[PDB]
Curated annotation (Swiss-Prot), chains A, B:
UniProt cross-link Glycyl lysine isopeptide (Lys-Gly) (interchain with G-Cter in ubiquitin), position: K8, K14, K18, K28, K40, K44, K50, K66, K72
Effect of S49L: In fatal respiratory hypoventilation; unusual apparent autosomal recessive inheritance; reduced binding to microtubules as well as increased fibrillization and aggregation
Residues glycosylated per entry: K44, K50, K66
Tissue-wise expression: Expressed in neurons. Isoform PNS-tau is expressed in the peripheral nervous system while the others are expressed in the central nervous system.
SUBUNIT field: Interacts with MARK1, MARK2, MARK3 and MARK4. Interacts with PSMC2 through SQSTM1. Interacts with SQSTM1 when polyubiquitinated. Interacts with FKBP4. Binds to CSNK1D. Interacts with SGK1. Interacts with PIN1. Interacts with LRRK2. Interacts with LRP1, leading to endocytosis; this interaction is reduced in the presence of LRPAP1/RAP.
Domain of life per record: Eukaryota
Annotated positions for site Not glycated: K8, K14, K18, K28, K37, K40, K67, K72
Portion of the full sequence shown: 621 to 697 of 758
PTM sites of type Omega-N-methylarginine: R46
Protein name as it appears in the record: Microtubule-associated protein tau
Location(s) in or outside the cell: Cytoplasm, Cytosol; Cell membrane; Cytoplasm, Cytoskeleton; Cell projection, Axon
């Protein structure tokens, strides 16, 4: 068997965004309290967690466009 | 009096033009005669004229777009 595979995708995509102004943004929350109490913590075998936190994230990009492509060609035998 | 003037115009204007071809242009007029006869010519105080002419102007731009802006802020007292 003469397998012949041609993989030719053509891509001319625009992901654009215009913006006049981003303007005044005020991120003024209040204070908080987080209290976690535990004694035994046994972790193993590909674990990743978070125990007790407080975040004030202000993420203001001037255009936060994403483009995620994925080309996957799997061949077996 | 505390005068406070904020002059912030935002301008994202496109003046574009596409053209496939400009093609054959033939500017073939005929000959002419211009005869102006005068004797006295007294000119003064910011004058600019033209007395007797003949022009064959061929103005072919490949995109002759113009953009004329004018920002004028006049403040008195």
């Amino acid at each position: 068997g003469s397998v012949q595979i041609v993989y030719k995708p053509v891509d001319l995509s625009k992901v654009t965004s215009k913006c006049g102004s981003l303007g005044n943004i005020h991120h003024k929350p209040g204070g908080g309290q987080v209290e976690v109490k535990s004694e035994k913590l046994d972790f193993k075998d590909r674990v990743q967690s978070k125990i007790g936190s407080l975040d004030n994230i202000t993420h203001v990009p001037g255009g936060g466009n994403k483009k995620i492509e994925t080309h996957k060609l799997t061949f077996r035998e």
